[PDB]
Structure 1
Amino acid sequence: DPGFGSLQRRLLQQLYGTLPTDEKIIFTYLQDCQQEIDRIIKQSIIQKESHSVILVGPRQSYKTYLLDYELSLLQQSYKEQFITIRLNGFIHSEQTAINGIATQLEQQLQKIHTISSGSLTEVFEKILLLLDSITKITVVFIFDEIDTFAGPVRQTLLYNLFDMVEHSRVPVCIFGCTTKLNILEYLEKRVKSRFSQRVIYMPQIQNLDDMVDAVRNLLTVRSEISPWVSQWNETLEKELSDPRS
């Protein structure tokens, strides 16, 4: 029957979170944090702050998930108010990261309405003079495994970006994702000092009951797609309720 296929579609696209952004259901045990992030990000876009921050927590901690949740949520609200730039630490070496910035910047400008031209040195100085310098566009960054930049050798790119945080009139924002709990000691004196010293640890599930409630959130559907949705959710809560099931 069509209904069962439709309901399976709904449940599956939920269990990837691929629902439309307004329908995503974020777990309670971390709401505040994204709330904490929400301000941190929205007042960095609307009120044009320029503060940096580092999310930290183990893998599979929804870091990029919370980030893209916020960005999508803002997209429908403030479409052109900003641009987004993500430079994964893994694939982007310290030198390739420059070209990454350049290219993502140019193809964001071509979406909001010559940069990659030149050599690595030239494109780097170009992005410098471009950023460092009615409203002004804010440019939000996202780093995955930012720690890989923070090798003992250079720690250059982080330094330059935190300098942008410190100086540039364009209100920038940085969301470093990583996993090294003692991320700070990696950052050198110059880098640490540049850094706003604000790092938010991501929470973990502290109570069995919290995980039960998280499963409840995930599995539950909130509208009628197939006639069984009521039957579905009632069977759901039945099986999830009894501590002997």
Structure 2
Amino acid sequence: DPGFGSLQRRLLQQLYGTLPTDEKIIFTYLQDCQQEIDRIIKQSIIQKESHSVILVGPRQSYKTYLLDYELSLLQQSYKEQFITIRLNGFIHSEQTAINGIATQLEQQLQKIHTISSGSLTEVFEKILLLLDSITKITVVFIFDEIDTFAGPVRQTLLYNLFDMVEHSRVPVCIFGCTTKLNILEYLEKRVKSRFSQRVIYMPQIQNLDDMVDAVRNLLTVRSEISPWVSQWNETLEKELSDPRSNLNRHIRMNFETFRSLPTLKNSIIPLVATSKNFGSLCTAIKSCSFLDIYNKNQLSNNLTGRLQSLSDLELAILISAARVALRAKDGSFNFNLAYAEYEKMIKAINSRIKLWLKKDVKNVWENLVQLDFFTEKSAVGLRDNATAAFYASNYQFQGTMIPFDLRSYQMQIILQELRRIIPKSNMYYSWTQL
């Protein structure tokens, strides 16, 4: 069935958004923001007016998608009118962004028709000579994660960028993107004064009909590139119009928990791709049993699923450690006290099962630390940045120089949570109460 292959491929690239530009899908709740971004970028590229605007919205809220759609829209009709410089706040640092701007400037100006050669002082003053200072070429700056350059110490790059926006003869468009709602408070006073205070907040999903209409936009094939298109559109419209269908129930569950269309797309894609024929795809979209299987797999390495993989000695040691941590006031325990509780519990069970020695319980203890059931007391864990991690790697911690049986640990799961989802018919269930 090559027609099913064509329909499956079309549905898959609609779900990945990799359509041609004229066929790109804009959701109805995203349309006002898309028009506002289109007006700003058209006033920059067509009409040579300088602009400064920060896009504020959560992750996966189509900030990059709308900007890329607008730039590819103006790419096909005004190609020689503008160049694009892309900076990302994670990849680029305050010194490295100068070199990135210079290298993108030379490779973008060689694409239409050196600036990037020398030390950092020379490169920066050459960029300033080009920008600080027929039609003029617009320079569009796309600044992702712009909050990292609005720091508390100094904001040199944002100062010079907004100075180029407000006081230069080359027209420049600067788009910032961030997740921080209070991005204007991050800005220094002179940087905020040079900024235009134009902040666009990305639209959120307000009602369930927005999610259903977006799913309808994603899964309806609007071109007749397969013979199965009409039946697929009919069955999809039948499932979406029915309020009691399984797909509507999954959309409602997403609206109540995640409220994220990329989250739903990540489940819809293997439902579409794992089907082998047209009727199998129709049964899959009518039942959505694969969505249940996917949801079960997404939770299988959580705290609930990791406990169900434990052995009887592992579960007994974990219960004993949770008992010792509950009785403690700092919630702290070690291997010796947990082994004392374990041997007490085994004696009171066999008085009313093999007792293992401390040498063999050492391995189960190490596995429980490895599976993130226990953690070291007041441990910071993974550091935020490379500098603090580098500082931590050059320090010898006091919990790594004492013997293992005296190291203080704290529970990632408490005894009440242990009682909740260990089954009532289990052997050690009675000792989850204290």
User: Which of the five TM-score ranges fits, normalised by the shorter chain?
Assistant: over 0.9
Task: State the alpha-carbon separation in 2 of the partners of residues 207 and 14 from structure 1.
Answer: 23
SS in 2 for 1:177: strand
- Give the drift of 1:148: 0.2
- Give the drift of 1:116: 1.4
Task: State the alpha-carbon separation in 2 of the partners of residues 128 and 8 from structure 1.
Answer: 51
- Give the drift of 1:153: 1.0
Structure 1 counterpart of 2:355: none
Please identify the structure whose Cα radius of gyration is greater: 2
- Give the drift of 1:43: 1.0
- Give the drift of 1:224: 0.8
- Give the drift of 1:226: 1.2
Task: State the alpha-carbon separation in 1 of the partners of residues 220 and 156 from structure 2.
Answer: 47
Task: State the alpha-carbon separation in 1 of the partners of residues 204 and 38 from structure 2.
Answer: 19
Tell me, yes or no, if structure 1 residue 230 matches structure 2 residue 244. no
Task: State the alpha-carbon separation in 1 of the partners of residues 143 and 122 from structure 2.
Answer: 23
Task: State the alpha-carbon separation in 2 of the partners of residues 171 and 114 from structure 1.
Answer: 21
Task: State the alpha-carbon separation in 2 of the partners of residues 225 and 51 from structure 1.
Answer: 42
CA offsets, 1:191-231, max 9 Å, x none? 11111011010010001111100100011111111111000
CA offsets, 1:40-89, max 9 Å, x none? 11111111110100000110011010000000011111111100110011
CA offsets, 1:79-100, max 9 Å, x none? 1110011001110001100000
Structure 1 counterpart of 2:197: 197
SS in 1 for 2:178: coil
Task: State the alpha-carbon separation in 2 of the partners of residues 221 and 156 from structure 1.
Answer: 49
Structure 2, unaligned runs of 5 or more: 243-434
Task: State the alpha-carbon separation in 1 of the partners of residues 104 and 155 from structure 2.
Answer: 22
SS in 1 for 2:175: strand
Task: State the alpha-carbon separation in 1 of the partners of residues 117 and 175 from structure 2.
Answer: 28
SS in 1 for 2:227: coil
Task: State the alpha-carbon separation in 2 of the partners of residues 75 and 125 from structure 1.
Answer: 30
Task: State the alpha-carbon separation in 1 of the partners of residues 205 and 160 from structure 2.
Answer: 36
CA offsets, 1:81-138, max 9 Å, x none? 1001100111000110000000000000111111111111110000000012210000
- Give the drift of 1:7: 1.0
Tell me, yes or no, if structure 1 residue 19 matches structure 2 residue 19. yes
Alignment of 1:1-245 (within 5 A): 1-242=1-242
CA offsets, 1:142-178, max 9 Å, x none? 0110000011011110110000001110110100000
SS in 2 for 1:41: helix
Task: State the alpha-carbon separation in 2 of the partners of residues 139 and 28 from structure 1.
Answer: 30
Task: State the alpha-carbon separation in 1 of the partners of residues 217 and 172 from structure 2.
Answer: 34
Task: State the alpha-carbon separation in 1 of the partners of residues 22 and 223 from structure 2.
Answer: 14
Task: State the alpha-carbon separation in 2 of the partners of residues 2 and 135 from structure 1.
Answer: 50
Structure 1, unaligned runs of 5 or more: none
Percent identity of the aligned residues? Answer: 100
- Give the drift of 1:33: 0.7
Task: State the alpha-carbon separation in 1 of the partners of residues 138 and 21 from structure 2.
Answer: 22
Task: State the alpha-carbon separation in 1 of the partners of residues 12 and 80 from structure 2.
Answer: 32
Task: State the alpha-carbon separation in 2 of the partners of residues 234 and 159 from structure 1.
Answer: 55
Task: State the alpha-carbon separation in 2 of the partners of residues 193 and 89 from structure 1.
Answer: 22
- Give the drift of 1:16: 1.0
Aligned length: 242
SS in 1 for 2:61: coil
Task: State the alpha-carbon separation in 1 of the partners of residues 173 and 202 from structure 2.
Answer: 18
SS in 1 for 2:76: helix
TM-score by length of 2: 0.55
SS in 1 for 2:86: strand
- Give the drift of 1:34: 0.8
Structure 1 stretches of 4+ with a deviation exceeding 6 A read none
SS in 2 for 1:77: coil
SS in 1 for 2:48: coil
Task: State the alpha-carbon separation in 1 of the partners of residues 91 and 227 from structure 2.
Answer: 47
Task: State the alpha-carbon separation in 2 of the partners of residues 37 and 9 from structure 1.
Answer: 31
Task: State the alpha-carbon separation in 1 of the partners of residues 211 and 116 from structure 2.
Answer: 47
Task: State the alpha-carbon separation in 1 of the partners of residues 209 and 150 from structure 2.
Answer: 38
Task: State the alpha-carbon separation in 2 of the partners of residues 119 and 234 from structure 1.
Answer: 63
